[PDB]
Enzyme design. Structure first.
Site, PDB file in Angstrom:
ATOM      1  CB  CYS A   1       2.704   1.304   7.251  1.00 49.41           C
ATOM      2  SG  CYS A   1       1.000   1.670   7.747  1.00 49.41           S
TER       3      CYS A   1
ATOM      4  CG  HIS B   1      -0.604   0.266   2.461  1.00 45.30           C
ATOM      5  ND1 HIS B   1      -0.609  -0.665   3.462  1.00 45.30           N
ATOM      6  CD2 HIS B   1      -0.152   1.409   2.999  1.00 45.30           C
ATOM      7  CE1 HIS B   1      -0.186  -0.112   4.581  1.00 45.30           C
ATOM      8  NE2 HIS B   1       0.131   1.152   4.317  1.00 45.30           N
TER       9      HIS B   1
ATOM     10  N   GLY C   1       2.324   6.159   9.756  1.00 41.29           N
ATOM     11  CA  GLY C   1       3.762   6.175   9.424  1.00 41.29           C
ATOM     12  C   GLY C   1       4.491   4.939   9.922  1.00 41.29           C
TER      13      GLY C   1
END
Ligand SMILES: O=C(Cc1cccc(O)c1)NC1(c2cccc(F)c2)CCOCC1
Ligand SMILES: O=C(Cc1cccc(O)c1)NC1(c2cccc(F)c2)CCOCC1
Lengths: 304, 304
Positions: B145, B41, B143
C-alpha cells in the site's frame, strides 16, 4: 497477490551509467569506483567491425581518445586496458554513487534486469533470461551498447551482463563484466547463428507454482510422472532436461502448494501434449520460462 | 531491435519512498518536497476497515501518531490533512532527492510503471495499464500500500497512481495523488466487483505496428475495413471501440510501416476471428494491449 514480470529497481545502476566516446563512436559505460567498463568495439570504425584486430586498433588510441561523460561533466581518463572484450578506463574520480557490487557470470536459465541506456542515459528497465543458447531476447537500438544486466541482493548489485551486439536474427549477445562472451559469439560484424532456443523447464515449473499460489489452478491434473518419463516429453518439446538439482530448488513451492514437483511435471506434460485449448495462465497463452524459482519465492514473499 | 515490456528507470521514484506507520499499521509513503502522501487507511485497525469513518478515526490521530522513516532516519511530522483518500503529512525537511514532478490523472488504456515497495523499500518495477474498468493487474502483497505508478518525460516524474487495495478477484484499485479513486471503488473492506475488462484496441494496434517494425509480419493480410465494420467485430470480442482520435495517434506507425491504420484494423479483425493458430507475435500467444502508441514510438526510437 497477482504475478508480474518484475525488474529490480534500477536506481543503483542508473547512478553508474556514463557515455563513452572514442573517435566518432559513442556508447554506454559502467562507472564503478575509478573504472569505467565499456565494450571494446567503442574503438572501431564501421570498416573495422568487418574483421577487427582489437590489439592493433587499440595501439592507435591514447587515454585522451576516450571521452567519458557522467551527466554533463567530463571524467579524466588516466589509464586504459583491454580485458577480453571489455575496455577498462581508469578515471581520476571514484564514482560517488558506486553501490556495493560484484561481477558474476550467470548460467543459462538465470534471469536478470537490463537497464537499457543511450548516450549514458537510462531509457528503460526490463527483465529477461540468459537463453540456453547464451543469447538474450532484449530491446536494444543502435547506441544501447554497454547497457548492463544485473541482480540485486538487498544493497549489493551483482552485474552479470554487458550488451555488445545483435545477431542477424535480432537476438542479443554480450559479455560478463570480465569481458567474456556468453556462448560462442565474437564482437565482429560477421553472420553468427544461435543454437536451439530451448525452454527453461525449471522456470516454467516455478511459474506454474506462482500460478497456483495466485489461484490459476485449471491445469492441475490427476497425474504424476518420473524424471525419466517427463524428460522424454521435455526432449520432444525442446524443453531443457529436468535434473534432481532443479527438483531441489522447487521444494518450497512444492511445500507451500502441497503439489509434489513430479505432480507439477505431470501437469506440465499434459499442457505440452494438449496445449492450453485457448485458456491462459497468469495472463499468458504460452508457458513463461523467464521466472526462476528464486524469482517466484522473492515476488510471492515481497523481498526488498 | 526486439520489443520488451519496459518500465521507466525507477531511481527518481526510489528516492521518494518512505515508510509510514500509524498505530500498529505500516505502509509506503511518497515524500515530495516537505509532504509525505500515503493511503488514508494507514489510520485504520482491521475492525475499522469493515466500515471506516475516516473523518472520525482521523480526529483521534495527532501529528506524533504518524511515524515517517526515510531510510533509517525519522522525519518530524509538523502537520497532517486528508485530501480525498490520501493523507498529506507535512514534515520539517524537504526531500533532498525530490525530482521535478507533476500529479496527473490518467485515462483508461494509459500505461505507467509501478515501483512495488514494502516498509518504504523498493522491491521491483513493472509496467501496467489502467484497465477500461479502472482496475490494474499488479503484483501487490500486504504492505505494498502507498506504492506509486508514474511516467517520466526526460527529468519530470508524472505520478498517476497510488496503490490502495486488492478486490476479492485479486485485481488492484487505487487513487491518483489527489486521493481520488480510479473507477467507483471505496477504501473499505467490503466486496466490490469490477466491470468488463475489455481489451485496449488502440494499444493492440500499436503493438501490431511494433511487431511489423521488429519483423513479425505473418498476420498482415490482404484486407482493409472501415471504423464501423471493425467496431462491430471489436464489440463482439469485448474490445474497446476505435475512434478517429485513436486512428490519429497510430499515424506515425502507419507512416513508418506503410500500413494504413484501417489495413492494420483488418489484420486485427482476422486475428480476432481466426485466432493465432498456435503462432506468436513478439513472443506472445495473445494480443498485448499494455503498450500505448507513445510507448511503441518511445521504445522503437530510444528516448531517455
Ligand atoms: O550489433 C550490431 C548490428 C546492428 C546494428 C544496427 C542495427 C541493428 O538492428 C543491428 N552492430 C554493432 C556490432 C556489430 C558487430 C559486433 C559488435 F560487437 C557490435 C556495431 C554498431 O553498433 C551496434 C553494435
Ligand atoms: O486490500 C486488501 C485485501 C487483501 C489483504 C491481504 C491480502 C490480500 O490478498 C488482499 N486489504 C487492505 C484494504 C482493504 C480494504 C480497503 C483498503 F483501502 C485496503 C487492508 C490491509 O492492507 C492491505 C489493503
Amino acid at each position: 497477490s497477482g504475478f508480474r514480470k518484475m525488474a529490480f529497481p534500477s536506481g543503483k545502476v542508473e547512478g553508474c551509467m556514463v557515455q563513452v566516446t572514442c573517435g566518432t563512436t559513442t556508447l554506454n559505460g559502467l562507472w564503478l569506483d575509478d573504472v569505467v567498463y565499456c565494450p571494446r568495439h567503442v574503438i572501431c570504425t564501421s570498416e573495422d567491425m568487418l574483421n577487427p584486430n582489437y590489439e592493433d586498433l587499440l595501439i592507435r588510441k591514447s587515454n585522451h581518445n576516450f571521452l567519458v561523460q557522467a551527466g554533463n561533466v567530463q571524467l579524466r581518463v588516466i589509464g586504459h586496458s583491454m580485458q577480453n572484450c571489455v575496455l577498462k578506463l581508469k578515471v581520476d574520480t571514484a564514482n560517488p554513487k558506486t553501490p556495493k557490487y560484484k561481477f558474476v557470470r550467470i548460467q543459462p536459465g538465470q534471469t536478470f534486469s537490463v537497464l537499457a541506456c543511450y548516450n549514458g542515459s537510462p531509457s528503460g528497465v526490463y527483465q529477461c533470461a540468459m537463453r540456453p543458447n547464451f543469447t538474450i531476447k532484449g530491446s536494444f537500438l543502435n547506441g544501447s551498447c554497454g547497457s548492463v544486466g544485473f541482480n540485486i541482493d538487498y544493497d549489493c548489485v551483482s552485474f552479470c551482463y554487458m550488451h555488445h551486439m545483435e545477431l542477424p536474427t535480432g537476438v542479443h549477445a554480450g559479455t560478463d563484466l570480465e569481458g567474456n562472451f556468453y556462448g560462442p559469439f565474437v564482437d565482429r560484424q560477421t553472420a553468427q547463428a544461435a543454437g536451439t532456443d530451448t525452454t527453461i523447464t525449471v522456470n516454467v515449473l516455478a511459474w506454474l507454482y506462482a500460478a497456483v499460489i495466485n489461484g490459476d489452478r485449471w491445469f492441475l491434473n490427476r497425474f504424476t510422472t518420473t524424471l525419466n518419463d517427463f524428460n522424454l516429453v521435455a526432449m520432444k518439446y525442446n524443453y531443457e532436461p529436468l535434473t534432481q538439482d532443479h527438483v531441489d530448488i522447487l521444494g518450497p513451492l512444492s511445500a507451500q502448494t502441497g503439489i509434489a514437483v513430479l505432480d507439477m511435471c505431470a501437469s506440465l506434460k499434459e499442457l505440452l501434449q494438449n496445449g492450453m485449448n485457448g485458456r491462459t495462465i497468469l495472463g499468458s497463452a504460452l508457458l513463461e520460462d523467464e521466472f526462476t524459482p528464486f524469482d517466484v519465492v522473492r515476488q510471492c514473499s515481497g523481498v526488498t
